[PDB]
Amino acid sequence: RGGISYDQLAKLSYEKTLRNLATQTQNSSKQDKVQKDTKTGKITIADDDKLVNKLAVSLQSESKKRYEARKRQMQNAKTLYGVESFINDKNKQFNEKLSRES
Amino acid sequence: YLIVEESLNNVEIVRSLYTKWCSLEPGVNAWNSFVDFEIRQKNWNGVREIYSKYVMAHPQMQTWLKWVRFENRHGNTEFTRSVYSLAIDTVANLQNLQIWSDMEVAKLVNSFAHWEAAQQEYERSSALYQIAIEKWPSNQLLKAGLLDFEKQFGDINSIEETISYKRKMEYETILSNNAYDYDTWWLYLDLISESFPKQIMQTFEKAIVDSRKELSKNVQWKRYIYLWMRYVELELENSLLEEEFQRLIDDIIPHKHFTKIWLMYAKF
Amino acid sequence: ADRELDKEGVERAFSILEDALHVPTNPEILLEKYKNGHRKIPAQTVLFNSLRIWSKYIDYLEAYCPKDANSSDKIFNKTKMAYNTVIDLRLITPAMAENFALFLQNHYEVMESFQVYEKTIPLFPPEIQYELWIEYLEVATSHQLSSLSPEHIRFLFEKALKNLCSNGIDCKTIFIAYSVFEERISGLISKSIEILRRGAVIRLQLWRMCISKAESTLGPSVTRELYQECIQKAVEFVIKFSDFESSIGAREILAYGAKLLPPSNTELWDSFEIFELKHGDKTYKDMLKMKKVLESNMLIDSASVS
């Protein structure tokens, strides 16, 4: 049991997004360079604007999905426990935090 | 850095990134994701170059046996035994460095042999057990893992030859630990009288009758007596019968030269 | 297959079913690419994996082979390679692994059927190995063709018995099979320390009790050591067994009745024990009444504690 370290958590997050990129290519397949300017020193990479848009969309979708999966957790945990005496929400979140200690 | 360039299908930038990242020797999570990257890209010649470097960065059998799990997944027989030949030579070449344990080298010898058993060459499966036990006489795990290979793939006289040795070492280590367990002596002698007959066979019978006082003890000497007697015998018989006998010496003189040795042993 | 077996020969039934079972180069990659393939890769390529296909293929071979095969025949060489291919494909069920080892023992290939048990036990998890070790250790000791040395049979037990109790199974029979055979081939009572280990693993009361009967046949010096070790609901049963040993060979038994009653609640069975020890004599209903008096006083003390 126990917790998962950050180097093991990062690999599992990297393994998970590779399966999201695998099925994204499978759902697409189901439906149907390097230039180095010598004067400036800058390196320009030419890439597809669709794959850059799909990168920007999927990060926003994962940002909203974790935002909504946490918002429902806020609305559920506020309306679970009311037995022990509280005063405000920061007291409830602290007295619940004492319960996970024991 | 990787999963963004994965998302852009820039396969030459993640490859350049991984070459740098595996140059700084980071750990086994990076390499295992780098061999999983080339499987995606089907670069079979490139992923074979990684395991050439991956065993040099993490010298240990779970990196070598991962590389033979790669090759036996693809069934290329010419490439797999080349990796197997490189893995077992490097243990021999780098014996003095002491970086592979006795349990660790037993996984290489067994996975080499059980692959050669599936490749129908039992004479290469059998001979490597002899070179490994001689090359390493210290590790008992490679000797004991030799036996399970004979149990599965060997002919019956060869198993009985090797079985007789492991029973010899295990009977020897209990009797050195436990002092007077007379029922294990009566098998350990009969281990050597049955299958070990030789100078050792006589010698243990000395070493047993060394260990021999109980009612539980003395009949073991009776066994060694006849074991000697079946094949001196009077001379050892007088030495043991000295435990005490005035009636015995009077019984001895009347029926030693008169009647036999069997009569002489009857007094004892 | 089934329509062609009736209309045409079983050799025709093999040949249409041989085309199913080509193991091409690499089953590990094809199995995985099929499972990862989202319904695009056909199951025509990974048709070899199917157990149902192999069992009824084999059952045609094992029915077609003669009662005396003796390894000269083509078919016995054919069904053995088809059986060994199932083990190499690793898709072999434990009832099917028995059917192949049974198959070799009928056709006098007994010493190769010990290889069959040897290959498969590694592959299976315990709670299933216990049913293979019964059939493997029984062929080693009971079957008439198996000429295995008594240090080789003792290897087969104490490789199993140590391995199988390590993962943790009751192992009541294997202890007894290593206990029963020791007289038929060796013939000394080393049986006890071989069977003591059943009582003290790290049902068990039913292994400890039958053997402490057995050394009262041989010799009382190795009985009385067990009577001590037997006592160290289940604890109460062990105390009762110790009282029975005392009756076979009385003060130590009564004091044991105290030790057991003090081991644990209820103690009336222990009263039956001491009463049995008193009844066993062919002396004065004085020590007995004193005993019941001591037991009653102890019960009163327990009531005071409660």
Residues C49, C89 contacting (CB under 8 angstroms): yes
Cβ–Cβ gap B167/C111 under 8 Å: no
Q: Token pair of B202, please?
A: 């006589």
The three-state secondary structure class of C94 is helix
**Cβ-based interface (< 8 Å): residues of B facing A:** 2-4, 6-10, 13, 27, 29, 33
The three-state secondary structure class of A97 is helix
Residues B53, B63 contacting (CB under 8 angstroms): no
Q: Measured between alpha carbons, how far is C255 from B156 in angstroms, rounded to an integer?
A: 56
Beta bridge partners of A44: A35
Contacts of B164 in chain C (CB under 8 A): 151
Helix axes B199-211, B215-230, angle to 10 degrees: 150
CA atoms within 13 A on the CB side of B210: 11
Q: Measured between alpha carbons, how far is B200 from C11 in angstroms, rounded to an integer?
A: 59
Buried/exposed C276-291: b ≥16 CB within 10 Å, e otherwise: bbbeeeeeeeeebeeb
- CA distances from residue C44 to B11, B182, C2, C12 in whole angstroms, order as listed: 33, 65, 20, 21
**Residue C196, φ and ψ in degrees, nearest 5:** -60, -40
Q: Measured between alpha carbons, how far is B252 from C252 in angstroms, rounded to an integer?
A: 46
Structure letter (DSSP) for residue A83: S
Q: Residue C66 corresponds to which amino acid?
A: P
Query: Any chain B CB within 8 A of the CB of A17?
Result: yes
Q: Token pair of B73, please?
A: 């997944």
Contacts of C29 in chain B (CB under 8 A): 73-74
* DSSP one-letter string for B40-92: HH--HHHHHHHHHHHHHHS-SHHHHHHHHHHHHHHT-HHHHHHHHHHHHHHHH
Which of C194, C268, C208, C216 has the alpha carbon at shortest distance from C238?
C208
Query: C182-186: which pairs have CB atoms within 8 A and are 24 or more residues apart?
Result: C184/C141, C185/C150, C185/C153, C186/B187, C186/C150
Give the contacts of A32 (CB within 8 A, at least 6 positions apart). none
Interface contacts (B, C; CB < 8 Å): 45
* DSSP one-letter string for B109-158: HHHHHHHHHHTT-HHHHHHHHHHHHHH-SS-HHHHHHHHHHHHHHS-HHH
Residues B9, A48 contacting (CB under 8 angstroms): yes
Distinct helix (H) and strand (E) counts, chain B: 16, 0
Q: Measured between alpha carbons, how far is C52 from A37 in angstroms, rounded to an integer?
A: 65
Domain hosting A83: range is 1-102
**Residue B214, φ and ψ in degrees, nearest 5:** -35, 160
Q: Measured between alpha carbons, how far is C61 from C57 in angstroms, rounded to an integer?
A: 7
Which of C197, C225, C185, C177 has the alpha carbon at shortest distance from B187?
C185
**Residue A44, φ and ψ in degrees, nearest 5:** -110, 130
Neighbours of chain A (3+ CB pairs under 8 A): B
Cβ–Cβ gap A18/B3 under 8 Å: yes
- Residue in chain C lying closest to B153 (CA): C115
Structure letter (DSSP) for residue B242: G
* N-term to C-term CA, chain C: 77
* N-term to C-term CA, chain A: 17
Provide the Cα torsion C194, C200, C202, C207; round to 10°.
70
Q: Measured between alpha carbons, how far is C263 from C241 in angstroms, rounded to an integer?
A: 14
Residues B241, B248 contacting (CB under 8 angstroms): yes
- Residue in chain A lying closest to B37 (CA): A18
Name which of A8, A13, A17, A35 to mutate to probe chain B: the one with the most chain B Cβ atoms within 10 A of its Cβ. A17
Closest to C152 (Cβ–Cβ): which among B153, B160, B186?
Answer: B160
Q: Tokens 């079979």 appear where? A: B44
Tell me the residue length of chain A. Answer: 102
Closest to B6 (Cβ–Cβ): which among A8, A11, A21?
Answer: A21
Give the contacts of C211 (CB within 8 A, at least 6 positions apart). C179, C191, C192, C195, C196
Residues C175, C161 contacting (CB under 8 angstroms): yes
Query: Any chain C CB within 8 A of the CB of B123?
Result: no
Overall domain count for chain A: 1
Q: Measured between alpha carbons, how far is B154 from B147 in angstroms, rounded to an integer?
A: 9
Q: Using alpha carbons only, what angle is made at residue B221 by residues B217 and B225, rounded to the nearest 5 degrees?
A: 165
- CA distances from residue C112 to C2, C116, C156, C218 in whole angstroms, order as listed: 32, 7, 15, 39
Query: C97-105: which pairs have CB atoms within 8 A and are 24 or more residues apart?
Result: C97/C132, C98/C132, C98/C135, C99/C58, C99/C62, C101/C135, C101/C136, C101/C139, C103/C62, C103/C79, C104/C80, C105/C139, C105/C143
Documented resolution in Å: 3.2
Residues A64, A45 contacting (CB under 8 angstroms): no
- CA distances from residue C263 to C228, C297, C298 in whole angstroms, order as listed: 14, 17, 13
Which of C126, C1, C135 has the alpha carbon at shortest distance from C61?
C1
Q: Structure solved using which method?
A: cryo-EM
Q: Measured between alpha carbons, how far is C140 from C121 in angstroms, rounded to an integer?
A: 16
Give the contacts of C262 (CB within 8 A, at least 6 positions apart). C298
Residues C165, C201 contacting (CB under 8 angstroms): yes
Cβ neighbours of C122 (radius 10 Å) = 9
Contacts of C28 in chain B (CB under 8 A): 72-73
Q: Token pair of B88, please?
A: 């077992």
Smallest CA–CA distance, residue C287 to chain B, in Å, is 37
Q: Residue B91 corresponds to which amino acid?
A: V
- CA distances from residue B132 to B94, B105, B141, B152, B167 in whole angstroms, order as listed: 14, 9, 11, 19, 20
Residues C120, C87 contacting (CB under 8 angstroms): yes
Q: Measured between alpha carbons, how far is B244 from B239 in angstroms, rounded to an integer?
A: 11
CA atoms within 13 A on the CB side of B34: 27
Query: Any chain B CB within 8 A of the CB of C163?
Result: no
Q: Measured between alpha carbons, how far is C87 from C277 in angstroms, rounded to an integer?
A: 60
Beta bridge partners of A43: A36
Q: Measured between alpha carbons, how far is B30 from B199 in angstroms, rounded to an integer?
A: 59
Residues B72, B80 contacting (CB under 8 angstroms): yes
